[PDB]
């Protein structure tokens, strides 16, 4: 099968660094340097090897046909009022980028508002963040480039979608807050850096401040608002209360769903906003997360995990803030976590439950927390939702493993409450009712049982004779809920393939004690949890070790590649996208520093001694039986990639093909494909994301030899 060689790639057998007493080599330490000739020619040397790879069997023009025709189909976001419009996002089907749409009501005919295809030819240009000013007249938006986190801040009048010549730059991780008075925009910016701010560097982030941009000005006279000169990594984001009395500074410092509430009551202000705001520190600590919901005069609603890990909403009233004082208007939930909330027409909540892994919509009143309405949901995520305070009706959109899903409307004004479907598409090329999801609970090796879903044809039987492909990612309180995915059906339908996505600990499942059971010193938890996944299907007769994939992105790379150095018995191929490598070198480029809430950081000799027994980078070691070698791996990142930099990625395949790679009973295939004109994944275009699922699923084809069921 392997009818190429691996590059020659330079090893500094010099680059050696003592953490507490261990000495740690890296060899392939210059990857880090994005800019350099060396770094350019690996790169260059590594894609002239998996491109063809991925492009010689016929399977993947099969496969990009058959997404290409299956993906086209309309998508639409909820409608939401602003002022006197409506807006709403719009994909025909296969535009690089979704469009934003106004109508002037319900009934009335659209007009593209921001159309973000005409930015670019290649659809690399994306709305990155967006604000409207109170009154709905005036218009905030982020572009990023290239899927940078980078964004510029540019600015229209929504009256005959007028430019403006307002823009700000130096624009990262920002909040967009307009003042009620119409006058100026809160946002967030970092200091002036040496060499590219483009995302193409590695440079940390450090020291971003918070703004204020008054429309009509240049940015260099806006206001300085708040700062942390001796807290480089804290990054405070503003938002106005729903009647523009006062803003609110929510100061984070690191990933955990935790943060300081700081208020500034506007009226106090001496001159209206001239400088450092007098800030009023509520809550001047980083034990737990106060998220805003609405607020009454002085009393104020939050949703909150302070000794609450299922979250519950609180009444903090400013005027008697003790906590001792705090009201509980809504209690936690023994089981159920408390996601999102929402204030509509007035004095309704909206409280959006995960239950074992499914969303759930009630109803109810704000004055004391008392269900009112359940809205009724098929099993699935609500992945959007439109209504604030002054509105009187909401949209929400509902979606799942075998349908696009359906957008609802509800006219809060009637006295009887009756959602209705507003817009609902399907996909023709998949019946969903051939498939069926079922949810199992697998126990670990703790004991702990994790839930699964598993999607798969009717009637199959469960010889361990069908290929599957099973994801997860682990980590930072997300919750990975259903989702309709084309690319996984057609694998389904047209590879014969099933589908799991293993809840693994880590996650925002069962809320903060899920998410504490998944980091530090208990990150293991999570490769074990992944693992017992893979052995429940080959055990229950799913799929066997030779025929499974294993999938995750960022901290869900990380996952696999950890679990490919671990159980390289288990799997027979590994798609690792975007993934953290270097668990010692993560927190010195771009927000990496942020992750230590997860991970712990090498610097501490007890976070290392944790580090160093599952960095995927420093766990690459030939498997001692004769019988065993490692599986297929696809590692996947991309040239802007700035919040996992790509020389993870880079230093890991380096050391795959030379430890791994070299040896004689290695035949699986071990490469990276590093793409152009892309980052992350947040933003990327419909062409570059069916060419990449394209080559996951040619990869596995070819690595697996499944044949195309047509």
């Known amino acids: 099968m392997l009818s190429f060689q691996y590059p020659d790639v330079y090893r500094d057998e010099t680059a050696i660094q003592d953490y507490h007493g261990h000495k740690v080599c890296d060899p392939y330490a210059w990857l880090e340097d994005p800019d350099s000739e060396q770094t350019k020619a690996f790169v260059e040397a590594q894609n002239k090897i998996t491109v063809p790879f991925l492009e010689q069997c016929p399977i993947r023009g099969l496969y990009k046909e058959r997404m290409t025709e299956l993906y086209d189909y309309p998508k639409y976001s909820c409608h939401f009022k602003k002022g006197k419009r409506y807006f709403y996002f719009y994909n025909t089907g296969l535009q690089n980028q979704r469009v934003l749409y106004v109508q002037d009501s319900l009934e009335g005919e659209a007009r593209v508002f921001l159309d973000p295809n005409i930015l670019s030819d290649d659809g690399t240009v994306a709305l990155r963040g967006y604000a409207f000013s109170e009154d709905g007249e005036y218009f905030a938006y982020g572009l990023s480039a290239s899927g940078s986190d980078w964004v510029t801040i540019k600015f229209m009048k929504v009256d005959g979608a007028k430019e403006l010549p307002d823009v700000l730059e130096r624009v990262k991780f920002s909040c967009m807050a307009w003042t009620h008075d119409g006058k100026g925009m809160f946002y967030n910016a970092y200091p002036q850096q040496d060499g590219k701010s483009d995302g193409t560097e590695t440079s940390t982030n450090l020291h971003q401040k918070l703004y204020y941009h008054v429309l009509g000005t240049d940015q260099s006279e806006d206001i300085l ?328 992105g960022s901290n869900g790379g990380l996952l696999v590649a950890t679990c490919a150095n671990q159980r390289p018995d288990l799997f027979g191929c590994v798609i690792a996208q975007v993934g953290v490598m270097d668990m010692l070198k993560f927190h010195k480029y771009t927000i990496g520093h942020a992750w230590t809430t997860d991970y712990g950081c090498s610097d501490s000799k007890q976070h290392f001694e944790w580090l160093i027994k599952y960095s995927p980078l420093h766990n690459v070691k030939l498997p001692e039986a004769d019988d065993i070698q490692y599986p297929s791996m696809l590692l996947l990142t991309a040239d802007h990639d700035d919040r996992v930099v790509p020389l993870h990625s880079l230093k890991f395949i380096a050391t795959l093909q030379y430890i791994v790679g070299r040896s004689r009973k290695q035949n699986n295939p071990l490469l990276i494909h590093v793409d152009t004109k892309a980052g992350h994944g947040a933003g990327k275009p419909t062409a570059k994301v069916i060419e990449e699922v394209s080559d996951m699923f040619a990869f596995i084809a070819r690595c697996l030899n499944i044949d195309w069921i047509p």
């Open 225 to 552: 608002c708040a700062e942390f000169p001796d807290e480089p990594k804290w990054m405070g984001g503003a938002e106005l209360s729903d009647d523009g009395r006062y803003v609110l500074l929510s100061i984070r410092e690191g990933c955990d769903p935790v943060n300081r509430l700081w208020y500034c009551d506007l009226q106090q202000e001496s001159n209206g906003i001239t400088g450092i705001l007098k800030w009023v520190k509520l809550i001047d600590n980083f034990e737990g997360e106060y998220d805003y919901v609405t607020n009454e005069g002085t009393v104020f609603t939050f949703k909150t995990n302070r000794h609450s890990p299922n979250y519950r909403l609180i009444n903090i009233d400013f005027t008697d803030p003790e906590e001792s004082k705090w009201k509980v208007l809504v209690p936690e939930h023994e089981k159920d976590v408390l996601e999102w909330v929402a204030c509509v027409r007035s004095n309704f909540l909206v409280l959006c439950y995960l239950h074992d892994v499914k969303n759930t919509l009630q109803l109810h009143d704000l004055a004391t927390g008392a269900l009112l309405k359940i809205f009724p949901l098929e099993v699935g995520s609500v992945v959007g939702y439109s209504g604030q305070k002054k509105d009187t009706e909401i949209f929400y959109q509902f979606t799942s493993f075998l349908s696009p899903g359906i957008i609802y409307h509800c006219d809060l004004t009637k006295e009887e409450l009756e959602p209705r479907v507003f817009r609902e598409v399907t996909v023709k090329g998949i019946d969903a009712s051939d498939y069926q999801t079922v949810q199992i609970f697998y126990p670990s090796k703790d004991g702990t049982k994790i839930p699964m879903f598993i999607v798969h044809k009717k009637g199959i039987k469960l010889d361990g004779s069908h290929p599957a492909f099973l994801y997860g990612y682990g980590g930072f309180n997300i919750s990975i809920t259903p989702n309709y995915s084309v690319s996984r059906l057609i694998f389904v339908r047209h590879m014969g393939g099933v589908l799991a996505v293993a809840n693994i600990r880590g996650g925002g499942e069962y809320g903060e004690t899920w998410h504490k059971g998944g980091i530090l010193a208990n990150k293991q938890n999570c490769f074990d949890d992944f693992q017992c996944a893979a052995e429940y299907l080959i055990k229950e007769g799913y799929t066997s070790p030779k025929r499974l994939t294993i999938n995750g």
